[PDB]
Design a protein around this ligand. Structure first.
Ligand SMILES: O=C(O)[C@@](O)(COP(=O)(O)O)[C@H](O)[C@H](O)COP(=O)(O)O
Ligand SMILES: O=C(O)[C@@](O)(COP(=O)(O)O)[C@H](O)[C@H](O)COP(=O)(O)O
Ligand SMILES: O=C(O)[C@@](O)(COP(=O)(O)O)[C@H](O)[C@H](O)COP(=O)(O)O
Ligand SMILES: O=C(O)[C@@](O)(COP(=O)(O)O)[C@H](O)[C@H](O)COP(=O)(O)O
Ligand SMILES: [Mg+2]
Ligand SMILES: [Mg+2]
Ligand SMILES: [Mg+2]
Ligand SMILES: [Mg+2]
Lengths: 448, 448, 448, 448
């Protein structure tokens, strides 16, 4: 054992290494600090994510470093590909994967910037995860909604509504045509609206809407809480009050608490909506953080029934091709690499169930064509402000959104170029839907 | 109710608003997108973090918006200060605070970049949190270590060591002079080292070291797991095998799972080490994300006994003044605003216990003076590679680090300018500590 | 440290002290013993309620006395105002507040008499309490009773009725027009009427009355018992038999047992009626004890849905202005100081839900105007003897009371001076309600 | 059934009634309001405590009123004796007894003032209660202290001491000669001293003192909390940390929570100290409230091992003869009526165990004779300020108090008139105890 500092690339840079089908592959966009070669930066990332530290240690003689070390096996431009042995990762733990890959390498002075673009989860590691508990087909059967994007909407204002008024808005939206509604990610339990009262009032509203309309309706009750036990108690109550849906902010709540909640919800027969609050703090920058496709893969492994993926045309940033790739990752059993969409690895899913992409944020009727072009039919379209911001109220807005979604889905099923004929399709739908006409007039030139 | 899109600043920009002592204040560095005024961007952040959406909603007539809305009450340069009413936040839930403040505002197209710099947690909201379960004084009493920084070290290599070899390294480090040791953040339970076997072997080593040295020793067993129940089971086993310490990756595991684990550990009498793995994905960029001082405040509220804060002179990025401010936040009962250190608010702590800052990452004996200058005595100095990378082994490295820390702490207590006389202090210590001399020679010019 | 007895005012009398918004303020009417100055008495009260004892102790050198001590910061007449630091009180514990403020200072020879008039609970301490689980609006929604005082009545005789006869009286009262009924505070479980049989028979009667009338009906089943576990079991059974209401004697049972019961009832979805039995042993005297406004604040913090507040015109002592102040404390989100009503502090409620004042005790139809003047619509009017003492039976008495309450509430909503036109309103109601006429004739000159 | 208001004395005043051995007898000092005869006031008290209301009710025809009604069977001066049938009271429930006897009769306008002086608990009702779990003899055997009053002391200052300093004071007191120590009634769990840390540190101190002195030592850890479950958890922890003692504020916490805690402590083998905080709010006034002898009877029924009874010569009000009567009630198996001591009934105890009277509050060495005269040997003498206020510290004060207690107990056992020779006995003890001499000099003229 030779004590002292040695370059990482001496051991953790293996350009000739051929990744094994069982290896976990990570793509890192690296901006090294001045004086640090890109190869050295990639080797440092691999070493400090898998086995290495800043200096040689005698203890390395007590284990097979070459069997366990992560190594950079390729560098294309600024993108370094690193392979990690399967044995490095705890089975069925997204937490361990994050602590390894994105644990400390992002804070190293040697790298000015570091972004995790894509991850290749091996089938062997995937088999250790449960996947979504319900799936797209089972959810559609539960809601009896087919050949159409599923409509929804966040109840607004985000905060300040009492349980009675909140449930009144929920009932208006559901009777107006929305398939589901949801609590806002920040609405968990507050003095103005405690979670028990909100659950009771909202489920009364949901049952009334189901009886009146005759269609399956639900509300994504937010069980997010400051402790896992409270989240489990809230999910149990949601099941008690008759809810078929719950929602959780898995990133803020955490992947461990989310795994516990997913197990409990599968036991309870509840569908889990996954809100990605706080993702943009590390998914937005193009030079640093984690691309949301990786988070989508992690969530699919952890077992979400729906997850937010982006609107592209909405108020929140999102790239069209990246969103298409994320939707394919969430919905397909095998996603081949697509450099245009940012997918740098062929990603099998080992039979893990698909989940619903959710489009939410500053989307109104005029955005329905584009959304259907991006997502097709197997997706959730959430209209919060587009529903309640209708001049005639939430019921009219829900009716307008339902009409627009149905018309665009019918055109898409017919093979029409919805991207080019979207305005005509919406106008034709509005000819018989005054609510749709009013919504189109109100938000004609509203763009982000 | 007037349907349509209105500027956020019309309602959510209130420059004349005077924050209440009960309000929660957030400072945001905002880089607005072209064509978006800074006032409009700040108002959008406040609205979409508290109550507002992209368009007016009739439901606003059902609640007092001005009582609940968050508003930007000041804009200095690119830093906008936003006040949130206390009633907006669920009691004792960091998850709700994150879902509100950093939920969706970071992904808005209107803002090119958004960074949460500082947060003013009101005393009323602080009283709803438990705080650290042990505290600095109680931990020192348990370890019987006073008037000296507490030594530690991550066992290396990060992965690949079996339980027997891992415990052998632990025993060598503890007998050499380290007060504690820890599992690496990515070492939870793997085929090469399962958590049960590691716990048993490591606690045997810790007990042997305690018997031989006669001083209190511990190992920060990592209970991080993919589910909260597994983490609780691992903490219970750690207590069963006689460990007085556990560690968890609270960010990757989550704040809800962390709160559950903290409650269970306080019940079990275990001290919790908090590893901030994955923080750099959103704390490093200067234009986007969350500054780690906010995360430190959140962790202190959630009840960590120690938390990593930075080395400044180590291998991971960290600013000296920011680290000093974070240490004051973690250790003081009241931290006045300090623009030099980035503290933009006076932060009371409502009697919440202080916790130990931890300095780890590419630090060896030569960095001990600076560290003591930055942190003083109430801190943990972690030497992973500095211990095992010693030429004569982990025991010699631990002895050298203990000697350096003791000498520098003695000089600091004597009022000497350790920053200027650090090399002389280390040389004088090495005159009687050959291990310290060897460590100094090996890493003389090693800088980051 | 100087051993020996020193005057309290030397340390615990700080006239220049400015109370902090986080401090807990107590107003004490003090009658000092001969030879004891009022300042000395107030200082003694503060010292022996917060930190001090009868003589100096060396241990005071081990803590910051000035940071933790309670101090008298003002003396107006015989009323001394004492400020206690927030850190002195355990979070979410009325028991600790009582043990501090009213623990031992009332038995001191130095003070001939001591009465706790008002307390200023800070918002920070309030946020640590749950508040009422249901609230006025939610309770009205559950009962579907709006714009009207809610009618009720204690079943009489207090004791000696079997479950069958008790339930028969309950059914007659509920079908006659009473919204709810209740067990007497002393009727818990006795050989003549065991609690299980009473619960079963009473819930059968309540369900029959609900079916016949078509209006929501309930009975405040008394779960008060000699142990907390028995109270929890009785509440669970009450939920099992379909009751939406339970009642407990929180003072006799205790605030700790009451807190446990409130948690369990919120879990069970039960509304809790709070009976203030044994309050008059320390709330009646004008020179000694605790004013009931303080107990009302404590109960609102502890989370009662309704609490008895007084009748003024009934058989039990009560001041009109004090009762108005107590009602405002129980029902308002912020109660400004009102010397006329005895409110010496501005009392925020930090979003804690309001609860229902209950007027009970020697009140018949003729007292309905005054009651509505005192309480308005958001209150419960309990007619025990006024219902069963009707010549034609409990059903006729309930009908008469309902008619009187409805007529007076309609007049009040119309802006009529119910205090001056109450007799005319009752006569006009009786023109179409023979039961009301009989009740008015029977109790025309019955006054207390 | 004749509807209308009738005088109470017509039915509830039965001067010729002969109380049955199974009846529960209450003595009430009554000050009737002007125009209300004393007989009418006593009848009203009986009626509204047992079965009656303000007017006749038809439901009385459904039960045997004369079998269940409470009746005033004698009026001597202003003291009315009322008999209540045994069947009126729930078995083993002090809460029900309080809700009946002292429920609402104290707030009646008909009575200007009402005080419950004494109660005759029948043997049949007593057999339904558990009594103290340990008893005087068992406690003495556990402590191995015989033929001597047991010494103790409240740790001062009441609040503001941390766990380490608190335990240091505890250790000094215990090693100095105190048999036990206790937390103050208001010290439960606070930011400055959390209950877990206090329990751990205090039990370490207690074990160290036991090892050093060789005598049994204990600390009355305060388990009082805002909920019964928290109190049970704290008692369980106290047992876990090795404590043989716990203390609870039974009045503030409540008799139901106290009964639950007593059951759990008997299961755990813990001795319960009963603090009577808040008693003086209703036991001090001579014209209104409840005399503490009744509360002492209730506590003995509920099963306390020790209870505070008064000092007479201390800082808190207390009558010598009343305190002697209370001590006899707590310690004797049968207490005959004693008008001089205020005992108006012969009180059997049906084999219920005796408990320890506790003398606390402004008592120093000079008060030891009087105390021994009042209580004898079977009592606890608590010196809070008398221990820590010693010039040389808590250890010296504890030594002085132990010396004084031992000397006075030896003189009492010898038949000496300790009341007349107390100063000589203390001086003779001080001839060989410099700490006692210093304590006597410091507090020579300190009187209350
Ligand atoms: O808070 C909001 O902004 C929303 O309720 C949308 O409301 P509106 O429909 O009224 O705009 C959604 O949570 C987001 O759009 C963010 O989802 P994500 O970023 O995960 O796509
Ligand atoms: O994995 C590592 O790099 C370490 O074990 C250090 O090992 P060495 O001492 O051998 O360098 C620590 O986890 C970090 O330094 C990160 O802590 P943080 O970023 O929270 O400060
Ligand atoms: O026992 C009673 O006297 C009552 O049932 C009233 O019966 P009636 O309606 O037949 O008089 C009520 O408990 C009280 O009036 C006391 O309530 P509070 O003192 O809390 O106001
Ligand atoms: O707080 C106090 O005053 C004490 O700790 C005494 O301290 P000192 O010995 O230092 O005076 C005791 O609780 C009381 O005397 C009241 O007991 P009670 O009224 O039940 O007799
Ligand atoms: Mg949302
Ligand atoms: Mg590490
Ligand atoms: Mg009653
Ligand atoms: Mg005390």
């Amino acid at each position: 054992f030779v004590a002292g500092v040695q370059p990482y690339r001496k051991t953790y840079y293996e350009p000739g290494y051929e990744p094994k089908e069982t290896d976990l592959l990570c793509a890192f966009r690296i901006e090294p600090s001045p004086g640090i070669p890109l190869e050295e930066a990639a080797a440092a990332v691999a070493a400090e994510s898998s086995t290495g530290t800043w200096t040689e240690v005698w203890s390395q003689e007590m284990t097979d470093l070459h069997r366990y070390k992560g190594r950079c096996y390729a560098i294309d431009g600024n993108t370094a590909y690193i392979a990690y042995p399967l044995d490095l990762f705890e089975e069925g733990s997204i937490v361990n994967v994050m602590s390894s890959i994105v644990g400390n390498v992002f804070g190293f002075k040697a790298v000015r910037a570091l972004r995790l673009l894509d991850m290749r989860i091996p089938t062997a590691y995937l088999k250790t995860f449960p996947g979504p508990p319900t799936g797209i087909a089972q959810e559609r059967d539960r809601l009896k909604v087919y050949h159409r994007p599923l409509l929804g909407g966040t109840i607004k204002p985000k905060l300040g509504l009492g349980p009675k008024e909140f449930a009144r808005v929920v009932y208006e939206c559901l009777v107006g045509g929305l398939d589901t509604t949801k609590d806002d990610e920040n609405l968990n339990s507050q003095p103005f609206c405690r979670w028990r009262d909100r659950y009771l009032y909202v489920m009364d509203a949901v049952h009334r809407a189901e009886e009146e309309t005759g269609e399956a309706k639900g509300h994504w009750l937010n069980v997010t809480a400051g402790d896992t036990e409270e989240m489990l108690r809230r999910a149990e109550f949601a099941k008690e009050v008759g809810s078929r849906y719950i929602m959780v902010d898995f990133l803020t709540a955490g992947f461990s608490a989310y795994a516990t909640l997913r197990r409990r919800a599968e036991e309870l027969g509840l569908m889990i909506h996954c809100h990605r609050a706080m993702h943009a703090v590390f998914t937005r920058p193009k030079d640093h953080g984690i691309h949301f496709r990786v988070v989508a893969k992690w969530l699919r492994m952890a077992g979400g029934d729906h997850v937010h993926t982006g609107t592209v045309v909405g108020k929140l940033e999102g790239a069209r091709e990246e969103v298409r790739g994320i939707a394919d990752l969430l919905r397909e059993e095998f996603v081949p690499a697509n450099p245009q969409r940012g997918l740098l690895f062929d990603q099998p899913w080992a039979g893990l169930k698909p989940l619903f992409p959710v489009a939410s944020g500053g989307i109104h009727v005029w955005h329905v064509p584009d959304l259907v072009s991006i997502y097709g039919n197997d997706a959730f379209f959430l209209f919060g402000g587009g529903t309640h911001g209708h001049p005639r109220g939430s019921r009219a807005g829900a009716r307008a959104n339902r009409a627009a979604v149905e018309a665009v889905a019918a055109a898409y099923r017919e093979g029409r170029d919805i991207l080019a004929e979207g305005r005509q399709i919406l106008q034709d739908a509005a000819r018989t839907c005054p609510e749709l006409r009013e919504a189109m007039e109100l938000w004609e030139g509203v763009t982000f």
